[PDB]
Amino acid sequence: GNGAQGTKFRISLGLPVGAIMNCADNSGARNLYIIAVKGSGSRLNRLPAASLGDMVMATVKKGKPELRKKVMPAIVVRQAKSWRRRDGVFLYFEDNAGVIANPKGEMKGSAITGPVGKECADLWPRVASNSGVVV
Amino acid sequence: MKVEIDSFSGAKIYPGRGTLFVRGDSKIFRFQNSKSASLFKQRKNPRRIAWTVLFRKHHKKGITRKTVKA
Amino acid sequence: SHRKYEAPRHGHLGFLPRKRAASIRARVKAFPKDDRSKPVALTSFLGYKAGMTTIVRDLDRPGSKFHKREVVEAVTVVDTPPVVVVGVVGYVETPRGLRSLTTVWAEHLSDEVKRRFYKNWYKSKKKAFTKYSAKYAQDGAGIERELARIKKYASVVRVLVHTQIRKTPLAQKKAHLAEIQLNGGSISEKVDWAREHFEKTVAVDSVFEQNEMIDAIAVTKGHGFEGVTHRWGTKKLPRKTHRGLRKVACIGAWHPAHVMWSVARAGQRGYHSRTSINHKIYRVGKGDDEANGATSFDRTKKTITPMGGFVHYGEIKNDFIMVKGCIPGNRKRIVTLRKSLYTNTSRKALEEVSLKWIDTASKFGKGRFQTPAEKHAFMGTLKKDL
RNA sequence: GCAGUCAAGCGUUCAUAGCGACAUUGCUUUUUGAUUCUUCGAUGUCGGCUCUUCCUAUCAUACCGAAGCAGAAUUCGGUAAGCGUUGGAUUGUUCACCCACUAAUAGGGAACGUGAGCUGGGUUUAGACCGUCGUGAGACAGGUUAGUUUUACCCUACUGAUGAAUGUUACCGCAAUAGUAAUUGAACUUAGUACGAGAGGAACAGUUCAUUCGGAUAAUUGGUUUUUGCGGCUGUCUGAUCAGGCAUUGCCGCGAAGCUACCAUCCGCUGGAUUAUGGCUGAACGCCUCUAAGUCAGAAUCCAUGCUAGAACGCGGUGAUUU
RNA sequence: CUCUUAAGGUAGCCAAAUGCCUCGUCAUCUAAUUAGUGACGCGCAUGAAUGGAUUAACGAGAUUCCCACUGUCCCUAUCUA
RNA sequence: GUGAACAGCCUCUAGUUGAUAGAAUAAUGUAGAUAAGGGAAGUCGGCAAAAUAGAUCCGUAACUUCGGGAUAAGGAUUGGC
Ligand SMILES: [Mg+2]
Ligand SMILES: [Mg+2]
Ligand SMILES: [Mg+2]
Ligand SMILES: [Mg+2]
Ligand SMILES: [Mg+2]
Ligand SMILES: [Mg+2]
Ligand SMILES: [Mg+2]
Ligand SMILES: [Mg+2]
Ligand SMILES: [Mg+2]
Ligand SMILES: [Mg+2]
Ligand SMILES: [Mg+2]
Ligand SMILES: [Mg+2]
Ligand SMILES: [Mg+2]
Ligand SMILES: [Mg+2]
Ligand SMILES: [Mg+2]
Ligand SMILES: [Mg+2]
Ligand SMILES: [Mg+2]
Ligand SMILES: [Mg+2]
Ligand SMILES: [Mg+2]
Ligand SMILES: [Mg+2]
Ligand SMILES: [Mg+2]
Ligand SMILES: [Mg+2]
Ligand SMILES: [Mg+2]
Ligand SMILES: [Mg+2]
Ligand SMILES: [Mg+2]
Ligand SMILES: [Mg+2]
Ligand SMILES: [Mg+2]
Ligand SMILES: [Mg+2]
Ligand SMILES: [Mg+2]
Ligand SMILES: [Mg+2]
Ligand SMILES: [Mg+2]
Ligand SMILES: [Mg+2]
Ligand SMILES: [Mg+2]
Ligand SMILES: [Mg+2]
Ligand SMILES: [Mg+2]
Ligand SMILES: [Mg+2]
Ligand SMILES: [Mg+2]
Ligand SMILES: [Mg+2]
Ligand SMILES: [Mg+2]
Ligand SMILES: [Mg+2]
Ligand SMILES: [Mg+2]
Ligand SMILES: [Mg+2]
Ligand SMILES: [Mg+2]
Ligand SMILES: [Mg+2]
Ligand SMILES: [Mg+2]
Ligand SMILES: [Mg+2]
Ligand SMILES: [Mg+2]
Ligand SMILES: [Mg+2]
Ligand SMILES: [Mg+2]
Ligand SMILES: [Mg+2]
Ligand SMILES: [Mg+2]
Ligand SMILES: [Mg+2]
Ligand SMILES: [Mg+2]
Ligand SMILES: [Mg+2]
Ligand SMILES: [Mg+2]
Ligand SMILES: [Mg+2]
Ligand SMILES: [Mg+2]
Ligand SMILES: [Mg+2]
Ligand SMILES: [Mg+2]
Ligand SMILES: [Mg+2]
Ligand SMILES: [Mg+2]
Ligand SMILES: [Mg+2]
Ligand SMILES: [Mg+2]
Ligand SMILES: [Mg+2]
Ligand SMILES: [Mg+2]
Ligand SMILES: [Mg+2]
Ligand SMILES: [Mg+2]
Ligand SMILES: [Mg+2]
Ligand SMILES: [Mg+2]
Ligand SMILES: [Mg+2]
Ligand SMILES: [Mg+2]
Ligand SMILES: [Mg+2]
Ligand SMILES: [Mg+2]
Ligand SMILES: [Mg+2]
Ligand SMILES: [Mg+2]
Ligand SMILES: [Mg+2]
Ligand SMILES: [Mg+2]
Ligand SMILES: [Mg+2]
Ligand SMILES: [Mg+2]
Ligand SMILES: [Mg+2]
Ligand SMILES: [Mg+2]
Ligand SMILES: [Mg+2]
Ligand SMILES: [Mg+2]
Ligand SMILES: [Mg+2]
Ligand SMILES: [Mg+2]
Ligand SMILES: [Mg+2]
């Protein structure tokens, strides 16, 4: 039911459909290929776009045969589009990365390779627990 | 409010200014503008760029009591 | 036959026509509701849009993720040297609407305002209001005859004020003259106050204060003739398409046999009047204050003028208003600031701000410094200098 | 294709909560047929793109009335078209069908809207292959592949732009009329409450954000570079140096200013009257009844406030008017 | 077994640029595939120089996917003549 | 001259300097360009555009009529002194 505790201030959208981002958890998915964004409305021809902390629906293009060929929810931990927070700073990661997780928002895996943006870790306390450096 | 500093050139960075970049390793790289940033992105060495605080510090450019009563 | 997919219409039909606005002055279409129990003050002010800068402040929005956190915000800066009152105009309501039944002008008129009644000032004999000034030679019973007339009649009294253009960096010399409505009580008290202020000066802080919400009324920065696509936001047409891609493919259906007021078509863009509302007043300037840019947190004596000076504008030597966000129109253009049309609770308004820091870095590029006193400190000493 | 009437039945019981047989009255002209009025000295044919407007037989969002409405959820209905109705996979396709998001992924019209707007993938000439048919030429409503998309300078229409005449010129104003705008979701809390045996599980007040839409604006961040602003490079030319020419802007790093991006920021108002509906008082009719007289409350409605034009044959106040 | 023929489709190939039914079924690739490919074959109407089957290499030939790449697109923006 | 080179680019000789012009620098265009994050979601279809590239070295599959395939694939280098 999109557990997702807190609001989220808007940050620039870097992840349209078709965009394939790296898999930052120990699940054994190598990449997540985003087919939709949770909580995007509609406009003629606009490609639904996710950003840090957004939950998406993905398939796994490279990975364990258990995880391939099936739709499943994700959470974007890592952006690469510069976005702007309310303290003024324009910041961006090196890669696009997310962690496969369940609709509740509970991670598939126990750990996250890499850092995570503070917005996403505040959003999803199960991503909080498994997170390394934050921002 | 903190003034931050450009880790490449060394120039002061006032709030809501410049860019910020989180490399894979979580080393945080703050630029005052596009110029420093774009250098960073070419693998340019600050000590080798004449106007960087790094360079002029390297070249030593322009640096120019009490009583014991116990 | 029908749309085949539904989308909003491009553009807001309410702002039609898209034509070039009537003058660089934007008209004040309304004034705050008169509460006559209050003392008589101006309802609006005249000024010039100088430029923008950045702010830093703590945020009071309990329950927000930034509550008690610092934020940067863009602001804009209006040169606001006191207005001078040159006259009052009275209005009576009729079944046909409100109607002005006289004006009264003070004796001596400034050579800035005088310059406004003239297309060529250097050639004129400068005769304006010379015979009108003769109305003061006696006790001024001709004057008083109107003044008391406006008292007798006139549900509504406005003041004619003008800018002090000379007192600003502009090159324009010919001041801007405008009607301001008087919202203190008792139409008599109003024209009393009017008279006593003839030829006098009135500055901005008699009108607005800090945290107050004010509306901006100005003419849009104009772009001249525009194509369909940027003017209305029409989607670009495909690459492969003959004879133009920035267009509307279907100007309309066969019937009706005429293209419609509602279809996007290429014409003027920009230079419209706009009435823009709800800006919080972040700072109330005094040109007689050194340490304008300063703050209880900052403390280092600097004015709001950036190094290198507001680009295309100048130095802000007088009082000023600083308002959150951006205001319609562009730099050097004459701008009206109006008190709000309504009482807004809204909690976002009513937030009482305290600026921490006002960005003094130069705007002619990516500025590295606030004061000249800092630039020396960091950089040290040069091949000029000592 | 859509809606009624009767009410045998269905619905544990109970015709009509929700339905409904036998029959019967209808509407509609996004079906197809029927016809042949118009056009064969020519009305560019399918679909899609794009864009605008209209319908309502409302999918969503407002307010309501009904339930086989405890709660949740759903379903029937009224006022309702103000407002939104998407992103993809195969397919030329309309259609069909799946995937996914969504408040919802309603149906239709405008010469089956829209080709001097596009495209040309299909259809529908002239090349060619196959299969069936034919002795044959050739045929095939059987499958394929290649196949030139013309013109606007006229009138009107629309978009913006000037303008004679009413003494002149100038400044400040009014506002008939015409336009109008906002949208929708979520989290916190109410509250693990009401309700329920439980499983489950709301709403108003409040707070924080978000969607679509719109008007701006350039502090900041990004884009753009003929500032050919500075620096670098190759080739060749000026004996060399210094400093430069030529390479359709020679190329590359940075690059102000300007323009400009939900890729950046800011902003988007408040009164009134009604609709359905629920009531008061209240006869007709000594009772009863929201209705007949009269009357209270009320929706994304409507009229305004606000917002944009400002009649070039609507107008008011005011300055100065030539030897 | 029977009726019938000049002989009654062999070897091969197949929903093939040959299959009406038809978007055939199964498999595969996909989140999803009237597409592709692999199979199956009472094949409307496959088939032996009316040439059948297969095929290295070739091809501005029709089609399918993948990697790279991209203003094709989200979504537009800016410059030069 | 550079260079593999009658390539492309610059030059000597000779021969031109002909093509209506002036002032601007709206929309739309024709011709040339660049774009943050995404990377074909656009679309009948990657149409179009981008990416690739020269030379030295290293590495080089299925299949094959043993000639090929083959620059397959894929890497490293490169100036001046
Ligand atoms: Mg959607
Ligand atoms: Mg489309
Ligand atoms: Mg920049
Ligand atoms: Mg429709
Ligand atoms: Mg008004
Ligand atoms: Mg074409
Ligand atoms: Mg001070
Ligand atoms: Mg600037
Ligand atoms: Mg018919
Ligand atoms: Mg029909
Ligand atoms: Mg006919
Ligand atoms: Mg005819
Ligand atoms: Mg005909
Ligand atoms: Mg014709
Ligand atoms: Mg015809
Ligand atoms: Mg025609
Ligand atoms: Mg209806
Ligand atoms: Mg129930
Ligand atoms: Mg249910
Ligand atoms: Mg409508
Ligand atoms: Mg029809
Ligand atoms: Mg048609
Ligand atoms: Mg047409
Ligand atoms: Mg055409
Ligand atoms: Mg055709
Ligand atoms: Mg064709
Ligand atoms: Mg012929
Ligand atoms: Mg045929
Ligand atoms: Mg051809
Ligand atoms: Mg073709
Ligand atoms: Mg012309
Ligand atoms: Mg006349
Ligand atoms: Mg119970
Ligand atoms: Mg209980
Ligand atoms: Mg509430
Ligand atoms: Mg917008
Ligand atoms: Mg805009
Ligand atoms: Mg350049
Ligand atoms: Mg050289
Ligand atoms: Mg040279
Ligand atoms: Mg020389
Ligand atoms: Mg030298
Ligand atoms: Mg030369
Ligand atoms: Mg050059
Ligand atoms: Mg810039
Ligand atoms: Mg924003
Ligand atoms: Mg109001
Ligand atoms: Mg009544
Ligand atoms: Mg408004
Ligand atoms: Mg009229
Ligand atoms: Mg008029
Ligand atoms: Mg008349
Ligand atoms: Mg007049
Ligand atoms: Mg097939
Ligand atoms: Mg075959
Ligand atoms: Mg096959
Ligand atoms: Mg099947
Ligand atoms: Mg298939
Ligand atoms: Mg495909
Ligand atoms: Mg077959
Ligand atoms: Mg059959
Ligand atoms: Mg046969
Ligand atoms: Mg045969
Ligand atoms: Mg034979
Ligand atoms: Mg045959
Ligand atoms: Mg053979
Ligand atoms: Mg053969
Ligand atoms: Mg050939
Ligand atoms: Mg060929
Ligand atoms: Mg094929
Ligand atoms: Mg050589
Ligand atoms: Mg040569
Ligand atoms: Mg020429
Ligand atoms: Mg323009
Ligand atoms: Mg360019
Ligand atoms: Mg790009
Ligand atoms: Mg990129
Ligand atoms: Mg990629
Ligand atoms: Mg594609
Ligand atoms: Mg596609
Ligand atoms: Mg598509
Ligand atoms: Mg498609
Ligand atoms: Mg091409
Ligand atoms: Mg070989
Ligand atoms: Mg190679
Ligand atoms: Mg070397």
PDB file of all heavy atoms in Angstrom, chain E residues 13-14 16 53-54, ligand 55:
ATOM      1  P     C E  13      13.227 -32.272 -46.071  1.00  0.00           P
ATOM      2  OP1   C E  13      14.399 -31.680 -45.379  1.00  0.00           O
ATOM      3  OP2   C E  13      12.423 -33.345 -45.463  1.00  0.00           O
ATOM      4  O5'   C E  13      12.268 -31.050 -46.332  1.00  0.00           O
ATOM      5  C5'   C E  13      12.799 -29.744 -46.352  1.00  0.00           C
ATOM      6  C4'   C E  13      11.909 -28.820 -47.125  1.00  0.00           C
ATOM      7  O4'   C E  13      11.188 -29.558 -48.138  1.00  0.00           O
ATOM      8  C3'   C E  13      10.818 -28.153 -46.333  1.00  0.00           C
ATOM      9  O3'   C E  13      11.302 -27.063 -45.598  1.00  0.00           O
ATOM     10  C2'   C E  13       9.839 -27.761 -47.413  1.00  0.00           C
ATOM     11  O2'   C E  13      10.344 -26.639 -48.131  1.00  0.00           O
ATOM     12  C1'   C E  13       9.918 -28.981 -48.324  1.00  0.00           C
ATOM     13  N1    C E  13       8.916 -30.011 -48.000  1.00  0.00           N
ATOM     14  C2    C E  13       7.547 -29.771 -48.108  1.00  0.00           C
ATOM     15  O2    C E  13       7.124 -28.664 -48.455  1.00  0.00           O
ATOM     16  N3    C E  13       6.692 -30.769 -47.813  1.00  0.00           N
ATOM     17  C4    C E  13       7.157 -31.956 -47.434  1.00  0.00           C
ATOM     18  N4    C E  13       6.279 -32.922 -47.159  1.00  0.00           N
ATOM     19  C5    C E  13       8.544 -32.222 -47.331  1.00  0.00           C
ATOM     20  C6    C E  13       9.380 -31.232 -47.632  1.00  0.00           C
ATOM     21  P     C E  14      10.982 -27.002 -44.036  1.00  0.00           P
ATOM     22  OP1   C E  14      12.043 -26.159 -43.433  1.00  0.00           O
ATOM     23  OP2   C E  14      10.826 -28.407 -43.592  1.00  0.00           O
ATOM     24  O5'   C E  14       9.495 -26.378 -43.922  1.00  0.00           O
ATOM     25  C5'   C E  14       9.162 -25.058 -44.368  1.00  0.00           C
ATOM     26  C4'   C E  14       7.679 -24.867 -44.688  1.00  0.00           C
ATOM     27  O4'   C E  14       7.132 -26.001 -45.393  1.00  0.00           O
ATOM     28  C3'   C E  14       6.723 -24.660 -43.525  1.00  0.00           C
ATOM     29  O3'   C E  14       6.708 -23.319 -43.123  1.00  0.00           O
ATOM     30  C2'   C E  14       5.380 -25.048 -44.106  1.00  0.00           C
ATOM     31  O2'   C E  14       4.817 -23.946 -44.787  1.00  0.00           O
ATOM     32  C1'   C E  14       5.758 -26.121 -45.118  1.00  0.00           C
ATOM     33  N1    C E  14       5.477 -27.490 -44.633  1.00  0.00           N
ATOM     34  C2    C E  14       4.153 -27.936 -44.575  1.00  0.00           C
ATOM     35  O2    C E  14       3.267 -27.174 -44.932  1.00  0.00           O
ATOM     36  N3    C E  14       3.859 -29.183 -44.158  1.00  0.00           N
ATOM     37  C4    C E  14       4.844 -29.981 -43.780  1.00  0.00           C
ATOM     38  N4    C E  14       4.512 -31.197 -43.366  1.00  0.00           N
ATOM     39  C5    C E  14       6.208 -29.567 -43.815  1.00  0.00           C
ATOM     40  C6    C E  14       6.486 -28.328 -44.249  1.00  0.00           C
ATOM     41  P     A E  16       3.806 -18.108 -42.677  1.00  0.00           P
ATOM     42  OP1   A E  16       4.333 -18.012 -41.285  1.00  0.00           O
ATOM     43  OP2   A E  16       3.075 -16.982 -43.323  1.00  0.00           O
ATOM     44  O5'   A E  16       5.027 -18.448 -43.645  1.00  0.00           O
ATOM     45  C5'   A E  16       6.169 -19.160 -43.174  1.00  0.00           C
ATOM     46  C4'   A E  16       7.071 -19.543 -44.319  1.00  0.00           C
ATOM     47  O4'   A E  16       6.632 -20.776 -44.904  1.00  0.00           O
ATOM     48  C3'   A E  16       7.099 -18.553 -45.461  1.00  0.00           C
ATOM     49  O3'   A E  16       8.123 -17.616 -45.233  1.00  0.00           O
ATOM     50  C2'   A E  16       7.345 -19.401 -46.709  1.00  0.00           C
ATOM     51  O2'   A E  16       8.713 -19.408 -47.048  1.00  0.00           O
ATOM     52  C1'   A E  16       6.967 -20.810 -46.262  1.00  0.00           C
ATOM     53  N9    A E  16       5.850 -21.420 -46.992  1.00  0.00           N
ATOM     54  C8    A E  16       4.571 -20.967 -47.163  1.00  0.00           C
ATOM     55  N7    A E  16       3.794 -21.798 -47.814  1.00  0.00           N
ATOM     56  C5    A E  16       4.619 -22.885 -48.057  1.00  0.00           C
ATOM     57  C6    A E  16       4.397 -24.097 -48.716  1.00  0.00           C
ATOM     58  N6    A E  16       3.214 -24.415 -49.249  1.00  0.00           N
ATOM     59  N1    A E  16       5.428 -24.969 -48.794  1.00  0.00           N
ATOM     60  C2    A E  16       6.599 -24.631 -48.245  1.00  0.00           C
ATOM     61  N3    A E  16       6.928 -23.514 -47.605  1.00  0.00           N
ATOM     62  C4    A E  16       5.883 -22.675 -47.541  1.00  0.00           C
ATOM     63  P     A E  53      11.897 -26.263 -52.714  1.00  0.00           P
ATOM     64  OP1   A E  53      11.054 -25.603 -51.670  1.00  0.00           O
ATOM     65  OP2   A E  53      12.489 -25.456 -53.818  1.00  0.00           O
ATOM     66  O5'   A E  53      13.029 -27.060 -51.938  1.00  0.00           O
ATOM     67  C5'   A E  53      12.678 -27.924 -50.876  1.00  0.00           C
ATOM     68  C4'   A E  53      13.815 -28.822 -50.480  1.00  0.00           C
ATOM     69  O4'   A E  53      14.320 -29.504 -51.642  1.00  0.00           O
ATOM     70  C3'   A E  53      15.033 -28.139 -49.898  1.00  0.00           C
ATOM     71  O3'   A E  53      14.882 -27.874 -48.532  1.00  0.00           O
ATOM     72  C2'   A E  53      16.131 -29.144 -50.154  1.00  0.00           C
ATOM     73  O2'   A E  53      16.089 -30.163 -49.169  1.00  0.00           O
ATOM     74  C1'   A E  53      15.702 -29.728 -51.496  1.00  0.00           C
ATOM     75  N9    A E  53      16.410 -29.104 -52.631  1.00  0.00           N
ATOM     76  C8    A E  53      15.877 -28.443 -53.709  1.00  0.00           C
ATOM     77  N7    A E  53      16.770 -28.015 -54.570  1.00  0.00           N
ATOM     78  C5    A E  53      17.979 -28.424 -54.015  1.00  0.00           C
ATOM     79  C6    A E  53      19.325 -28.283 -54.430  1.00  0.00           C
ATOM     80  N6    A E  53      19.713 -27.663 -55.554  1.00  0.00           N
ATOM     81  N1    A E  53      20.284 -28.808 -53.634  1.00  0.00           N
ATOM     82  C2    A E  53      19.918 -29.437 -52.506  1.00  0.00           C
ATOM     83  N3    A E  53      18.700 -29.627 -52.011  1.00  0.00           N
ATOM     84  C4    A E  53      17.768 -29.097 -52.822  1.00  0.00           C
ATOM     85  P     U E  54      15.280 -26.441 -47.982  1.00  0.00           P
ATOM     86  OP1   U E  54      14.907 -26.309 -46.543  1.00  0.00           O
ATOM     87  OP2   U E  54      14.721 -25.501 -48.991  1.00  0.00           O
ATOM     88  O5'   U E  54      16.859 -26.509 -48.017  1.00  0.00           O
ATOM     89  C5'   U E  54      17.516 -27.617 -47.428  1.00  0.00           C
ATOM     90  C4'   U E  54      18.985 -27.645 -47.752  1.00  0.00           C
ATOM     91  O4'   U E  54      19.201 -27.945 -49.152  1.00  0.00           O
ATOM     92  C3'   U E  54      19.728 -26.350 -47.531  1.00  0.00           C
ATOM     93  O3'   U E  54      20.043 -26.175 -46.162  1.00  0.00           O
ATOM     94  C2'   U E  54      20.948 -26.508 -48.430  1.00  0.00           C
ATOM     95  O2'   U E  54      21.946 -27.248 -47.757  1.00  0.00           O
ATOM     96  C1'   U E  54      20.414 -27.374 -49.571  1.00  0.00           C
ATOM     97  N1    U E  54      20.219 -26.656 -50.855  1.00  0.00           N
ATOM     98  C2    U E  54      21.279 -26.729 -51.721  1.00  0.00           C
ATOM     99  O2    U E  54      22.291 -27.325 -51.423  1.00  0.00           O
ATOM    100  N3    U E  54      21.111 -26.112 -52.933  1.00  0.00           N
ATOM    101  C4    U E  54      19.999 -25.433 -53.366  1.00  0.00           C
ATOM    102  O4    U E  54      20.008 -24.917 -54.484  1.00  0.00           O
ATOM    103  C5    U E  54      18.933 -25.389 -52.419  1.00  0.00           C
ATOM    104  C6    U E  54      19.071 -25.995 -51.229  1.00  0.00           C
TER     105        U E  54
HETATM  106 MG    MG G  55      12.123 -23.115 -47.170  1.00  0.00          MG
END
